[PDB]
Design a protein around this nucleic acid. Structure first.
Lengths: 117, 97, 88, 66
RNA sequence: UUGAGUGCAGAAGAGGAGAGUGGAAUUCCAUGUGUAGCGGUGAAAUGCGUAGAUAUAUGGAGGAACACCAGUGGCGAAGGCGGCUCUCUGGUCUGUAACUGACGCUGAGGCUCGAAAGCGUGGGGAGCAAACAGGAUUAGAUACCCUGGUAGUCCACGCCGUAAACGAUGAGUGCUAAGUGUUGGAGGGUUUCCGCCCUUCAGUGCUGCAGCAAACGCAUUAAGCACUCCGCCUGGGGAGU
């Protein structure tokens, strides 16, 4: 519990799912939330409709342990991070640092084949 | 003619005072002991680094000016002795124009 | 290649007379020392292909000059090949 | 009508003049092209090799997004 | 001495080989935090996860490739060459003229170089992925789709010698309107010239007279006017057998 009350949330998104986890300043974990974990199936996990309620189910368990301020970290650029932040503001947080760090190479390894569709 | 080879090598800030002069004078010996001719070998700047190396985010730079023909062997010997040490971190040898 | 020290050595201890820096007896000794040093480089580094083409060009041009001089005076040609150590 | 550094004759980049050299980088840690600064042709290559020397000795980090 | 070469003075440049080095990113391993899913599709499924996954911070291992600079930019005879530092070394351009004095060009036979894939011997595997396994689609799918996965891709030493190896335009030289960018120079007017303006050399694009062409088009980097030398063609298949 311990009422750490100042942490960083992490928004990780694909083209078919997203995951939000609110962590500490380490960031040691408090609570995660996943679009498949909230009952969705199939392709619907791409839309930001799951992002709002995933952010809500994260922040409830988060500020049961005491939470005031939060920072934003964005990975995997798609549709999820557009509405995850403004839904994350809605249940009472203090968003004050927004960054989009993407794991970007400098041409290290090879990407796979194209899709002949 | 000969060349001119700068050596701007990174010195640890957590050394003692005689360690600095002893190390600088020792590498001046090993440049002098194989025919190479140093001119102006002074300390440069205490400086914080842009990022660490092991934990050293701060350091003290240095500068020399040695002139020698290419036929000698101390310069690669200085490279071999510099890479096996620890108290010097990174050095670069650039021709002077 | 050669430095200008050995260059200016051999272009004047082998020149015909004053002011000779053409005079094809000079150019063949210049090319001779050049192709000896380049041959030693090719023995050291044995896949520097892009300088071996320059070896080919130099030896061909020295061959053209050497075959020129023999169609003017065979005595100078014999004196040089007994003097410069070539023509096997 | 575009910017340059050839008015003040910095004839050699000196490998150390990193306080003047801040003109030709960015926040994220990249290089402004010649379409941006309007500098010279060979001056661009000199500055390019210069700051690639400078990135190695802790005078500018590769990644600066913190 | 006008062609053709060495002077001396410079200049540019991912030209080549050899030796070291830098950070990011992926994969693996260790540690902490943290629970029910992760991953994938048009839609699903195979698959991995309570033997604690995915995710997030800390380190440790190893291989491969060099983010912006990057431009119809550069280099080389072509194939090709982009992180950084050093040793050997090839080639091109600009000035100038004392010096050689026609020494040139092309070049059947011969030799050398020559992308990937492939073969032999010895190393290493981070990704990627022929052959192959499984799931899916379909009337059927020995394919396209998804999950895995060896040889290979890398280095050293030998071999083979092919491509849509293309500008599908052989090489050397001379001559024949302009306009416009740009790479590297030299000269003059002017000048904190670093800009600018005029003159001129070598590349390198774009548009367009005459001229050529069956048309498309080309056009001082000719597919125009010509000379020198080499290679090749003579209906489609049969067959580069």
């Amino acid at each position: 519990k311990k009422n750490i009350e100042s942490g960083v949330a992490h928004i990780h998104s694909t083209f078919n799912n997203t995951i939000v986890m609110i962590t500490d300043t380490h960031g040691n974990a408090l609570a995660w939330s996943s679009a498949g974990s909230l009952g969705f199936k199939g392709s619907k996990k791409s839309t930001p409709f799951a992002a709002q309620m995933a952010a809500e189910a994260a922040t409830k368990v988060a500020m049961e342990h005491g939470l005031k301020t939060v920072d934003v970290t964005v990975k995997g650029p798609g549709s999820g991070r557009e509405a995850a932040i403004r839904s994350l503001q809605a249940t009472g947080l203090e968003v004050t640092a927004i960054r989009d760090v993407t794991p970007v190479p400098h041409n290290g390894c090879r990407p796979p084949k194209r899709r002949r569709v | 003619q000969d060349t001119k080879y700068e050596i701007m090598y990174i010195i640890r800030p957590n050394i003692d005072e005689e360690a600095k002069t002893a190390l600088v004078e020792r590498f001046d010996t090993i440049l002098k002991d194989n025919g190479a001719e140093v001119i102006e070998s002074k300390d440069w700047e205490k400086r914080r680094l842009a990022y660490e190396m092991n934990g050293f985010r701060e350091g003290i730079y240095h500068i020399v000016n040695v002139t020698s023909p290419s036929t000698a062997g101390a310069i690669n010997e200085f490279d071999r002795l510099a890479k096996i040490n620890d108290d010097i971190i990174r050095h670069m040898i650039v021709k002077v124009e | 290649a050669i430095s200008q020290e050995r260059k200016n050595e051999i272009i004047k201890e082998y020149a015909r007379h004053e002011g000779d820096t053409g005079s094809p007896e000079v150019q063949i000794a210049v090319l001779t020392e050049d192709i000896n040093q380049l041959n030693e480089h090719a023995r050291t580094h044995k896949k520097d292909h892009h300088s071996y083409r320059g070896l080919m060009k130099k030896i061909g041009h020295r061959r053209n000059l050497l075959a020129y001089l023999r169609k003017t005076d065979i005595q100078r040609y014999r004196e040089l090949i007994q003097r410069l150590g070539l023509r096997r | 009508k575009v910017d340059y550094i050839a008015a003040n004759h910095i004839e050699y980049i000196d490998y150390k003049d990193t306080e003047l050299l801040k003109r030709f980088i960015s926040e994220r840690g990249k290089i402004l092209p010649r379409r941006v600064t309007g500098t010279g042709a060979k001056n661009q290559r000199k500055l390019t090799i210069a700051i690639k020397r400078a990135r190695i000795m802790g005078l500018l980090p590769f990644v600066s997004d913190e």
